[PDB]
Amino acid sequence: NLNMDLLYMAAAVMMGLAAIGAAIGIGILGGKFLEGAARQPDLIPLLRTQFFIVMGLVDAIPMIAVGLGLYVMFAVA
């Protein structure tokens, strides 16, 4: 019936836009790490620590959008 048509599409827009924001945000944040690794070798492990702190905050809202698109897909429809 009409339910699964729209509820896949709703999950698709949720995990599609989450796939934009987490890829673009880790692309900008990661490229600034790699100029810092090129510019300051000897600091790769210290900068990598800072990159993993900041990466956990970038992935926050996109991981709630993944987890609820997995819910809509395999629980609600």
Binding site: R39, Q40, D42, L43
Partner: protein, 57 residues
């Protein structure tokens, strides 16, 4: 600093040939000025030349 880029004069190098700039007089009568400098130069120059390191003036 650790922010150093690459640059010949600033960074070190494995040594085979060494150069000396020696300043010296246009005029005599200065007494034992020049030669007491030049023997110190030659002692150092000999020291490198001992191990075969080349030298230039």
């Amino acid at each position: 600093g650790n922010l150093e880029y690459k640059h010949p004069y600033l960074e070190d190098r494995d040594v085979k040939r060494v150069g000396y700039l020696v300043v010296s007089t246009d005029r005599g009568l200065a007494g034992g000025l020049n030669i007491n400098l030049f023997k110190k130069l030659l002692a150092e120059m000999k020291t490198w030349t001992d191990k075969g390191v080349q030298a230039d003036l």
